[PDB]
Design a protein around this nucleic acid. Sequence first.
RNA 1: AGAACUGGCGAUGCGGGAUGAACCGAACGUAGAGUUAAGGUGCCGGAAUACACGCUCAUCAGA
RNA 2: GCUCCACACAGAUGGAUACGAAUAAGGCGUCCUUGUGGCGUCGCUGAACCAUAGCAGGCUAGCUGCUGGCGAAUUGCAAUGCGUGGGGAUAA
Lengths: 134, 170, 106, 197, 69
Amino acid sequence: DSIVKASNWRLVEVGRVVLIKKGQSAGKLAAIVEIIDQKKVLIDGPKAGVPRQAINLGQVVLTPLTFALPRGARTATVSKKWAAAAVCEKWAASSWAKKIAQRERRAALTDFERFQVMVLRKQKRYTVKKALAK
Amino acid sequence: HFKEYQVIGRRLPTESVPEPKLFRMRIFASNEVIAKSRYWYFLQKLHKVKKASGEIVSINQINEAHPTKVKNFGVWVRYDSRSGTHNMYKEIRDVSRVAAVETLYQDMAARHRARFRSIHILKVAEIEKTADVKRQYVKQFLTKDLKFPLPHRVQKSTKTFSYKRPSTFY
Amino acid sequence: AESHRLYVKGKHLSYQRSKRVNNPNVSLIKIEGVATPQDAQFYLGKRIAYVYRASKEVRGSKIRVMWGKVTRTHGNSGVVRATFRNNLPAKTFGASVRIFLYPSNI
Amino acid sequence: VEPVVVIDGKGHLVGRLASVVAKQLLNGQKIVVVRAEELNISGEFFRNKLKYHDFLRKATAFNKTRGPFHFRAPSRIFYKALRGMVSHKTARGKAALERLKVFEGIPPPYDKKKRVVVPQALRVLRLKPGRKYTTLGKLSTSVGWKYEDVVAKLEAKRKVSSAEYYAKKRAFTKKVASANATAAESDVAKQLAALGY
Amino acid sequence: TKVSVEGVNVEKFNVEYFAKEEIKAERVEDQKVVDKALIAEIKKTPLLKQYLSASFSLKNGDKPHMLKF
RNA sequence: AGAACUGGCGAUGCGGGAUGAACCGAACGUAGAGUUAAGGUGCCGGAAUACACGCUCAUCAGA
RNA sequence: GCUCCACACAGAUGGAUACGAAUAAGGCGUCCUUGUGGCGUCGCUGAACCAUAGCAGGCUAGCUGCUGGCGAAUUGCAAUGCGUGGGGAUAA
């Protein structure tokens, strides 16, 4: 049997959902509408609020998720297939969006709320240390 | 960064010469003053005038029609060199007229060492129907369902010390 | 129990200088976890202390302190300009400097 | 942010690494580079072999014994690349270099202790894919250093003694992952998650 | 984090109260009367009593330009 | 090589060009604060191992 | 070095928090057909992890794991709070 594996990648494609690192959008999802060249893609996310623009692929990181979308699809057509595939649910269900949300949630804790975290982590420790050494 | 300007001039009307021919041309420049300056330089090449003899009638910006649609720009360019001047045609797949001429100036600097003063932009025109695309590297992206990866991603660390040994998958 | 720390700890890098001239009045301070001028804007006006052991006991303590202020940012890294009452000794280029949280904007 | 910052040359670039290690000293930041030998440069081998020998023909006239002492041992090969950016004369320097410790391989008492890497100096993060690039090791060997072997062997041994470790550990954190996985869900938990934890 | 304060009678003491010309009994009585009228509202919210007994410090990783107080 | 013309040094520090009669910036009471020039920001070296488009492998690249 | 007398006193501030190899690839978990095996899952920064409450951290009662009982001031509105100079004994 021929076992040639794997070289699994995130391909740039018409209908690839992306996450923007740098820019005014910053941490908001868009989809690759049409590839311009090696370095530039044309993106839009009508639900997130990110406008339609040419963007360098250094500005943006790709995500594991995709959906079927025609080449050079307009904002309204993007919105239709976006809602049909339901990629926001597919996004938030992942461990990845959960990590970003966790960083954001920890960033806006009150000093008293941080004290609460401390007290509860003492309690959780006691239950775990009980379960061990048995 | 650039902007497109519509400049018209008519060599100030004298006695028994009422309202001359009005030479119209589209200029790419960073600002309004540079656009005027470049306009006089082109008039003096096409015919015999001077800056004092003429007048800028109207200088207006031309915004691009659909800056949400990917186009194929076939640009004709004349440019000076170490040797005598010579015509050229290149092809750029881009969004706007302004972004197309921008990337052309960067490419002309890269491959030919020609600065802004050396370059004349003859005529920028779209290519609507495919198979008129004479260049290979523009035709390269025009295939059905182009799906390619961007492997070996350079991830910028803000800190100087990483603790993981970075694994550049994509 | 462990932490009694009410200060952000940052290293004393150098004096404000060119290639060939240094002004010893204005000291340059790297602060921990500060990457941009925008993050450093928070630390502007906060009191600084350089704390060190000395040989002779002065006031029932073998430890002396030089006090000062952050004045402004210095470049894109979050390195910060700082003027003390008595200038820092230049022997301290790469020594820990305690940046406090008073006076508070927040 | 850590009294000592043991670094691991393995897959770095003499110059960049160095440099960054330099700055870190002049700013009171003890350091300790390891696995020195398994360092990296740029450009074919035959290269670094020249851009060195030249550094070898050096030597002083009348008395070759008082001139540019050509150290073979990598650790050193690299230590130079560094003392080259550090006034290494004015006390401010001496004070530095005095803050360094480049070892070939990874001898105690570090072996047992975490290390790191300077993401801004990795062959795999600076050199355009498939492109010639030395490996000190050979380079040293080719020009003296008489131990590449010892470390070599005397190395693999270290990796063992450890690898074995990890297991024990990995096999340990396999429990925890469960301990919590189970002790998870409960209450006290839920709450935390809310706040983030 | 705010508490209820409207039950407390603060208006007795001002600038002149803190003159010095071993601890006076008048100062101790003003302490207890106020503090009992405050303790009652601290007991409402969970862990707030324990929060006030604790001491603030900046741990390794606490960047005050990021921290929301 | 010679002739004419206007500057620079001569009687002139200072920032920069690694270093300098001929380059670049800038004509100086003593200071404090702010902003810049010329030149630069891997480190020595104060300042972005900034961002973006391309190009270049050299057996002593190149700056 | 042992003994007897006399004297002298380049920058800590929660924790360096241990796999190796590869990067056009890798971890971690599971099933085993023990494999360059299958299934699942992770990365997109350490923004983590572990530690973290008490006079700069007390004194006492039970069931900082949980519940208690006391003390803090007046520090006054900031000023961090291990060699000598001689003996004796024995190795050189």
